[PDB]
């Protein structure tokens, strides 16, 4: 909320979304692996061996 | 992705990858002649064992 409010339907004029980001959950499987989580500028490099 | 045509030697078991092991060599045998009809005896190389 921006200020106190009484009961009523949702009004986008009063609230405020909170800027947020996201990540990726990576699970190495047989024959392939991954390095990092990508979103943090750690490029996702995969190796096979 | 591994193929199923059977023209394959890299079938991967548990673990990331198989690499390769003993492959089906032809084993070109030496010449045969009068195999069980004529017999050879020698001291330099023969071995009755």
From TrEMBL, chain A:
Localization of this protein: Virion
Signal peptide coordinates: none
Protein name: Putative tail fiber
Organism per entry: Agrobacterium phage 7-7-1
Full protein segment contained here: 99 to 147 of 587
